[PDB]
Symmetry: D2
Subunit: 149 residues, 4 copies
Amino acid sequence: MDYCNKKHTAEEYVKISDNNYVPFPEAFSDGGITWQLLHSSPETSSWTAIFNCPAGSSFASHIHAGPGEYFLTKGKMEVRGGEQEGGSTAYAPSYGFESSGALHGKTFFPVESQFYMTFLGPLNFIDDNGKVIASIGWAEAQGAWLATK
Amino acid sequence: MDYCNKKHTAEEYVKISDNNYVPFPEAFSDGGITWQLLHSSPETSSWTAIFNCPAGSSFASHIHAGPGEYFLTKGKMEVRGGEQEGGSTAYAPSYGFESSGALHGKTFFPVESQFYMTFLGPLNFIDDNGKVIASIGWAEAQGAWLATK
Amino acid sequence: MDYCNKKHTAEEYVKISDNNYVPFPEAFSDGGITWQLLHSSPETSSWTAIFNCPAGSSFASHIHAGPGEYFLTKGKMEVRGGEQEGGSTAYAPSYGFESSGALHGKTFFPVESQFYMTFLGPLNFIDDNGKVIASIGWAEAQGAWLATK
Amino acid sequence: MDYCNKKHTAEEYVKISDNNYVPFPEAFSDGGITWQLLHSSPETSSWTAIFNCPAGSSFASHIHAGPGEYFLTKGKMEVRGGEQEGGSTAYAPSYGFESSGALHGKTFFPVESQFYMTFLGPLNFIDDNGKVIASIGWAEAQGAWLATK
Ligand SMILES: [Zn+2]
Ligand SMILES: [Zn+2]
Ligand SMILES: [Zn+2]
Ligand SMILES: [Zn+2]
């Protein structure tokens, strides 16, 4: 009924160890992709993670509901079809801004790579007809991360 | 490629006139709900709108992907089942913060009401088996607004 | 050093009573402006409030660090100098989007007014030479609110 | 005035080359810190950059108006005084969430390092008494970047 007093949000520190990477859900990827969830902002709805991708691996088709920013630290990544199809081809080290609405039918890694990314909102994985089969946000990502970890 | 130079985003002013309220899609509501899209932030993925709701009207079942804030200027609104079912019943004038993940089965207006609201991210409308039949973000809302208007 | 588990953020409901409006700080306004702080998002850094402005009142000079959106429910408001000086003159009911960087030397109310507003980030109040004398965000706003009521 | 139509925000790709690192302003750091601005969101108020910091270098005293997230790819970094003073001592590779209100009196790099970071809102640099002497956001950061091209 009344204004809710708030306290300063706690700062966080997460050491990234090779030992903590786990298999990324097979339902949403191809190839032995592994990852780590690094942070969730339940109030903002943003989340951050890091990924290791083998040569020839990819992610299932999805649309970004909000802006996402990536930092490719190792390898090469083809987004939105790669440069050969009007999209972008990233070489490490590099950065990218993938806006709200960005369609990623098959983000592909031709070489063993690694990339860090922050997402605002969910990733809507779609079927061959463009219908949403699953809306994956911080909560769904955290559920999967802890279910495997 | 290279860093993209940016300029100051333009400020906006929108007069709210009775003449511009249009019928809200029948697929996602019941009763003669009318509305007006006021602003869309394509970079942030946030959007803002105002609604006029007849007595007995409601919205179809949906989940808030991100935080949303409402200012009920007139009437009464039963959110998350209303006070009688553990949720809240807003009485004008009042404010509300509905967080990311909030499930709104049938937001109901017992009396003729009006409310202003800002949304971060999309509203995922679901069927009786939990499946997301439509992810409505700034882009989808603008499309429905301009198509009807 | 490890990932921090998060839980769904709590929803909020705030009844706005005429009895809870208190005097806005005299150092940052002129005339007899009264207000109420409605919500703070310590994680996002956004905050929301509502103001009652007497005829002839105004706010001290400031720059918006981030985007702010207002809903003028009563009266008239001159922002950025008003229409007569390249800015905007708002008439109730109306909406407005004031972007990051917006300079508000003396937001003025020629007539008794009222407006609701959401802010992302702080408002940097500046002196006549443009030097920042106070950066007011959700924390500073909550501090002033709890100290007066 | 009426609703302003919007279109999908353009995706971006930026190659991080050593050709682009330039000296960071000496008025806000000590040591030979170099950097690259990667992205500015004028609508959202967020911005992103990457820094190369020599052993013994540091940043001038500041407070984060909003949340910031970093990825330390090389070296070591002491934040909020280091674990020695109730803060954190980050070792590459590691991640950190520095919330709104975070006080960074003298972020220090004992060894040659590198870190990528996203900021929401400005960094308020303060004098010895705690007075804001400079509010640096995307616009101020872009100005410094373009100037020292
Ligand atoms: Zn994607
Ligand atoms: Zn809802
Ligand atoms: Zn202002
Ligand atoms: Zn800092």
